[PDB]
């Protein structure tokens with residue numbers, strides 16, 4: 001017997017107590033070892049409601065990653081609130097590791113194992129777990145990287161699809177590689193290579209999934225209509241360096257177009273931080289070939305408003321609220337109290 005409750009979670013990780021990589025160092029002192037003997041408990045014939053868009057776990061992971069980056073990804077200068085601060089900003093080792101979220105005694109985590117679960121409402125195949133699986137805290141905009149994949153079809157997630165202000169999380173069932181490189185020896189110029197055959201296939205499937213939700217209306221993709229570079233570009237951290245990649249070549253409805261898509265990128269030093277209002281300034285990039293090969297496993301989308309008297313729905317890549325990133329992996333969990 002249980003009821004919906006919120007409590008203070010703890011984390012578990014396979015961090016190596018030697019590694020200087022920042023998530024390992026943080027997980028070494030802020031998390032416990034992962035359960036070596038985990039065993040979920042099926043809740044035979046239990047139907048339970050979930051809400052990924054209203055889930056305290058997401059906020060608790062958000063505070064962790066805020067704490068993690070604050071302890072690890074230190075800018076030389078922060079302009080937080082007008083009170084500029086010039087501190088140490090050594091170049092670090094940065095490569096996200098899986099974090100597990102675990103309940104204390106007297107609570108458990110209910111896990112939705114419905115393969116088509118969209119994030120909100122009833123789940124019919126519920127199990128109980130002590131900890132989540134290992135979630136990589138990958139910070140990004142527009143494209144969700146290195147996540148899990150949807151088990152069956154492409155899943156559309158939104159608190160309310162009808163509300164255009166509510167962000168859409170596309171959970172892909174097939175990952176699309178994105179290979180980003182700042183070549184060795186304009187030291188901020190970089191590029192991400194994406195196989196255009198794969199991407200346009202997956203994007204076409206996304207259009208067709210979106211059609212099912214929008215009355216078979218014409219689905220149009222467009223670049224973001226204004227905003228900061230972090231969200232108008234596909235932003236992410238690669239080996240400590242902030243990459244900003246132009247995805248206009250991705251979010252065109254063009255598709256003699258199917259070779260390698262090369263996105264122009266810039267490594268940016270002055271960041272509009274995702275943690276909270278503030279610009280952070282980092283050092284110029286490290287030397288050498290800076291390369292991150294990531295799986296695109298999700299897309300963050302915002303649907304244009306004022307199209308109800310038209311035949312089209314236009315979608316633009318979104319992001320900025322990293323809670324939606326954690327939400328994209330935490331969606332099948334929810335904390336309950338042992339009543």
Ligand SMILES: N=C(N)NCCC[C@H](N)C(=O)N1CCN(C(=O)N2CCC[C@H](C(=O)Nc3ccc(Cl)c(F)c3)C2)CC1
Pocket residue numbers: 139140141228230231235236237242243271272273274275276277319320321
């Ligand atoms: N109880 C509640 N429900 N509270 C609501 C929470 C809102 C949240 N606390 C908040 O204040 N917030 C500050 C304003 N925020 C912003 O203004 N922006 C606009 C500028 C860019 C930012 C970007 O995404 N930066 C970025 C940087 C590096 C990388 Cl690698 C990357 F992928 C992305 C996003 C964020 C949330």
Ligand SMILES: *[C@@H]1O[C@H](CO)[C@@H](O)[C@H](O)[C@H]1NC(C)=O
Pocket residue numbers: 113114125127
């Ligand atoms: C429920 O999920 C389990 C994994 O926990 C898996 O065997 C299958 O997808 C589902 N099985 C039943 C009997 O519902």
Ligand SMILES: *[C@@H]1O[C@H](CO)[C@@H](O)[C@H](O)[C@H]1NC(C)=O
Pocket residue numbers: 118119120121122156157158160161
């Ligand atoms: C998710 O599924 C539930 C089923 O109860 C439904 O009410 C809700 O509208 C669905 N959301 C989306 C975005 O499809």
Ligand SMILES: *[C@@H]1O[C@H](CO)[C@@H](O)[C@H](O)[C@H]1NC(C)=O
Pocket residue numbers: 146147174175295
């Ligand atoms: C990338 O995707 C492949 C298959 O889609 C998967 O086997 C691999 O584990 C993924 N890599 C990472 C780092 O998640």
Ligand SMILES: *[C@@H]1O[C@H](CO)[C@@H](O)[C@H](O)[C@H]1NC(C)=O
Pocket residue numbers: 151152153154155173174205209
């Ligand atoms: C992914 O989902 C789409 C529907 O959204 C489906 O047509 C396609 O076959 C799926 N691919 C895989 C590998 O499951």
Ligand SMILES: *[C@@H]1O[C@H](CO)[C@@H](O)[C@H](O)[C@H]1NC(C)=O
Pocket residue numbers: 160161162163164
């Ligand atoms: C979904 O959003 C629309 C648009 O504002 C709103 O009219 C509707 O009431 C919302 N649905 C729910 C369940 O809140």
Ligand SMILES: *[C@@H]1O[C@H](CO)[C@@H](O)[C@H](O)[C@H]1NC(C)=O
Pocket residue numbers: 179180181193293
């Ligand atoms: C990534 O791109 C670089 C530069 O084009 C290339 O040398 C490397 O082989 C690529 N790696 C993968 C896994 O595609």
Ligand SMILES: *[C@@H]1O[C@H](CO)[C@@H](O)[C@H](O)[C@H]1NC(C)=O
Pocket residue numbers: 195196197198
């Ligand atoms: C691009 O993707 C298609 C389909 O997945 C594949 O057949 C092709 O080999 C890929 N191209 C390259 C250059 O890897």
Ligand SMILES: *[C@@H]1O[C@H](CO)[C@@H](O)[C@H](O)[C@H]1NC(C)=O
Pocket residue numbers: 232233246247248
């Ligand atoms: C991305 O590139 C396109 C085409 O070159 C350009 O029109 C657009 O302004 C670029 N995006 C940004 C945010 O500058």
Ligand SMILES: *[C@@H]1O[C@H](CO)[C@@H](O)[C@H](O)[C@H]1NC(C)=O
Pocket residue numbers: 095096138145146236237238239291292293294295
């Ligand atoms: C995604 O995972 C791969 C393999 O672990 C890693 O090389 C890459 O840097 C990761 N990408 C990001 C953005 O963390």
